[PDB]
């Protein structure tokens, strides 16, 4: 399907016999599932979003089926806040990143989506994440006013700044929206200016 991205692209899998809702997670390297038991062996690992690292159980191969089509591949399960499907799997389902709807640039997840934008004058490069409302920015001394607000992922939450009505250029489209700047290991264009671009999931 084609999916719009006005609303979190949440979608059911099934995985070790039961159904679960998961988030569609361009900005994930990997697929991260809440606690639950799965049949066969797993191995500890750590992984990092944008609060800090969680420790999780990796199991290998898998089969997970994503709204009807079929993966084999690594899930992590732990305590997610959220259950993430990541581009591990997403690529294995063929899903690309489109612009404008497919009339624009066509970017596939066998790597980190990142691109170029231009914010407050600079040019940063930042991931386009399906799995963001926000879009978050590195420390920048940007003009103007702001609110305080938290934001959370894996890891927990931190603290950020708020600017309202700024304009930001994602490669060479325009974008006018809220920016939320922090300590964020990465930049990230999240759903708030990714649908301002036309962006949508397609697989």
């Not at 420790?55 to 084999?72: L, W």
Request: hydrophobic letters at 40%; one cysteine or more; aromatic letters at 4%.
């Amino acid at each position: 399907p084609q999916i719009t991205l006005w609303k979190r692209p949440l979608v059911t899998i099934r995985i070790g016999g039961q159904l679960k809702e998961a988030l569609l997670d361009t900005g994930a390297d990997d697929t991260v599932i809440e606690e639950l038991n799965l049949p066969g062996c797993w191995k500890p690992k750590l992984i990092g979003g944008i609060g800090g690292f969680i420790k999780v159980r990796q199991y290998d191969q898998i089969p997970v089926e994503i709204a009807g089509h079929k993966a084999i591949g690594t899930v992590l399960v732990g305590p997610t806040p959220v259950n993430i499907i990541g581009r591990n799997l997403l690529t294995q389902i063929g899903a690309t990143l489109n612009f404008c709807g497919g009339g624009g640039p066509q970017i596939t997840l066998w790597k980190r989506p990142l691109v170029t934008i231009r914010i407050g004058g600079q040019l940063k490069e930042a991931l386009l994440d399906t799995g963001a409302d926000d879009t978050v920015i590195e420390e920048l001394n940007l003009p103007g006013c702001w609110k305080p607000k938290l934001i959370g992922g894996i890891x927990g939450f931190i603290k950020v700044r708020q600017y309202d009505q700024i304009p930001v250029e994602i490669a060479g489209h325009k974008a006018i929206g809220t920016v939320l700047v922090g300590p964020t290991p990465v930049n990230i264009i999240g759903r708030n200016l990714l649908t301002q671009i036309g962006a949508t999931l397609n697989f």
